[PDB]
């Protein structure tokens, strides 16, 4: 189309992803890329007829959940300050009662520390936290091969994530 060739959907829930894809198709979108830390969401994107995926191999998505938005924001803000100081690239978005934080470009020991602070911050502010991805490099290599067997044509990875993973492979 006139504005581009590919639309990028960041998918945090299978149902929300399928609804978003259908809305874009009705507006006349032809190619939709799906980004997720959740391997099951990317497999569902392929099943729906997509073939462009954005993976997160070395990083993770932290999801804070709670009815008080100001408490989600206080938890998220501490994660953001720490992650940026460690040199990570962050993607944030509000989705109902959920605040999603996609973190890339930090080594395994730093990812482990951030995942621990997420649990601590959730207890402090009286909210729940979910962590998606964070796998070792062998799990990533296995899940990418599975996406390819299921008919992925183009798999994209954040450069900072790819550089962390290459250093870890060596």
Pairing mode of beta strands 32-35, 52-55: parallel
Q: What is the 8-class DSSP label of residue 2?
A: -
End-to-end CA distance of the chain: 42
Task: Please give the Cα distance from 158 to 143 (Å, whole number).
Answer: 16
Is 4 a binder of a copy of itself (CB under 8 A)? yes
Task: Please give the Cα distance from 54 to 122 (Å, whole number).
Answer: 28
Site string for Co ion, 74-113 (x = CB under 5 A): -----------------x----------------------
Cβ–Cβ < 8 Å for 71, 126:
yes
Give, as ranges, the residues between 74 and 133 that touch a copy of itself (CB under 8 A).
Answer: 76-77, 80-81, 84-85, 87, 89-94, 99
Residues that bind Co ion (CB under 5 A): 91
Residues that bind a copy of itself (CB under 8 A): 2-10, 20, 23-24, 27, 29, 32-33, 54-55, 57, 69, 73, 76-77, 80-81, 84-85, 87, 89-94, 99, 140-141, 144, 154-159, 162-163, 165-166
């Amino acid at each position: 189309g006139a504005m581009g060739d590919i639309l990028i959907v960041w998918a945090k829930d299978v149902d929300e992803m399928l609804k978003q894809v259908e809305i874009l198709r009705r507006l006349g979108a032809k190619q939709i890329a799906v980004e997720s830390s959740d391997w099951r969401i990317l497999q569902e994107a392929l099943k729906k007829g997509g073939d462009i995926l954005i993976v997160n191999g070395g990083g993770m998505t932290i999801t804070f959940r709670g009815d008080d938005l100001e408490a989600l924001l206080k938890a998220a803000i501490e994660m953001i300050k720490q992650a940026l100081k460690f040199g990570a690239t962050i993607e944030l978005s509000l989705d109902g009662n959920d605040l999603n934080i996609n973190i890339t470009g930090v080594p395994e020991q730093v990812r482990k520390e951030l995942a621990k602070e997420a649990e601590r911050l959730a207890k402090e502010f009286g909210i729940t936290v979910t962590r998606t991805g964070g796998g070792d490099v062998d799990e990533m290599l296995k899940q990418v091969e599975i996406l390819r067997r299921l008919g992925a044509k183009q798999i994209a990875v954040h450069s900072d994530d790819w550089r962390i993973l290459q250093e870890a492979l060596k």
